[PDB]
Design a protein around this motif. Sequence first.
Motif, short mmCIF file in Angstrom:
data_model
loop_
_atom_site.label_atom_id
_atom_site.label_comp_id
_atom_site.label_asym_id
_atom_site.label_seq_id
_atom_site.Cartn_x
_atom_site.Cartn_y
_atom_site.Cartn_z
N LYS A 12 -1.68 -8.00 7.58
CA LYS A 12 -2.09 -8.40 6.24
C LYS A 12 -3.14 -9.51 6.29
O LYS A 12 -4.14 -9.47 5.56
CB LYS A 12 -0.88 -8.87 5.43
CG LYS A 12 -1.22 -9.21 3.99
CD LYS A 12 -0.04 -9.85 3.26
CE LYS A 12 -0.31 -11.31 2.93
NZ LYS A 12 0.79 -11.91 2.14
N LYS B 224 5.55 -2.54 -2.32
CA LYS B 224 4.40 -3.05 -1.59
C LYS B 224 3.81 -1.96 -0.71
O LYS B 224 4.53 -1.14 -0.13
CB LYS B 224 4.80 -4.25 -0.73
CG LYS B 224 5.30 -5.45 -1.52
CD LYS B 224 5.71 -6.58 -0.59
CE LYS B 224 6.15 -7.80 -1.38
NZ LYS B 224 6.57 -8.91 -0.48
N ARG C 140 4.56 -0.93 2.79
CA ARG C 140 4.27 -2.17 3.50
C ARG C 140 5.51 -3.04 3.53
O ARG C 140 6.24 -3.14 2.53
CB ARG C 140 3.11 -2.92 2.83
CG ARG C 140 2.80 -4.28 3.44
CD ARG C 140 1.47 -4.81 2.93
NE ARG C 140 1.47 -5.04 1.49
CZ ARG C 140 1.76 -6.21 0.92
NH1 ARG C 140 2.09 -7.25 1.68
NH2 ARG C 140 1.74 -6.34 -0.39
N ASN C 141 5.76 -3.67 4.68
CA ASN C 141 6.92 -4.54 4.90
C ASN C 141 8.22 -3.75 4.84
O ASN C 141 9.25 -4.25 4.36
CB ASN C 141 6.94 -5.71 3.91
CG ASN C 141 5.78 -6.67 4.11
OD1 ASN C 141 5.10 -6.64 5.14
ND2 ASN C 141 5.55 -7.53 3.13
N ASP D 135 -1.44 -11.24 -4.76
CA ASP D 135 -1.61 -11.10 -3.31
C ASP D 135 -1.95 -9.65 -2.98
O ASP D 135 -1.14 -8.88 -2.46
CB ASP D 135 -0.36 -11.57 -2.57
CG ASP D 135 -0.55 -11.60 -1.07
OD1 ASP D 135 -1.62 -12.08 -0.62
OD2 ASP D 135 0.35 -11.14 -0.34
CL LIG Z 1 3.65 -10.56 1.20
#
Ligand SMILES: [Cl-]
Length: 214
Positions: free
Chosen positions: A121, A175, A197-198, A2
């Motif tokens: 995203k 991430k 990220r996140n 991903d």
């Molecule tokens: Cl994700």
Amino acid sequence: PDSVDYRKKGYVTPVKNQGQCGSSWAFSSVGALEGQLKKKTGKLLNLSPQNLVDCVSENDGCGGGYMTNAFQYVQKNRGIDSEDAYPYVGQEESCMYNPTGKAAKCRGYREIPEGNEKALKRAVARVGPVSVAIDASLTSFQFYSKGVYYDESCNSDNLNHAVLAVGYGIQKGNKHWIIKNSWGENWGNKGYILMARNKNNACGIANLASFPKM
Ligand SMILES: [Cl-]
């Protein structure tokens, strides 16, 4: 996997340097337009941030601006010039747009839901490079060299610098967003930074995100 890196796919031009002009909004905007030019036509070229600095009256030239104002300008103006036709000089001048140098067009824009990193995203995956604004004021951000950047003191309510999300992924279990800056290839990792990220919308990465329709 991903992850996506649009630099590998030909969607991202070389890293630019805004110089002594607070025009990161313009570089962020042309970067998003460049990515959509590649996706829609199969090829890209450098678009003109100077076109936007001089001609987007809703923004403040070297004093700041919003990326959606730029996308709205390109739409109503029926084009934006290439960099070669309208080169960057690092200071605001009178608007000298010329349709002979037109190299891209815009049919509007979409703003990502504020603070929603999952929506950001999906936009990066389904659109391409997305214009974003962040808090870049911390010293830790400015001396970044490698790794995934996270600093708890980053103020998501203080968006002061516009950049470009050209992908996302994961590195050593962290991430990240792949972020194109406009401080030259000399800055960061060849002009880029990997931002967490996140992690509760670190630095406000998803608070002012948008992309142009083409
Ligand atoms: Cl994700």
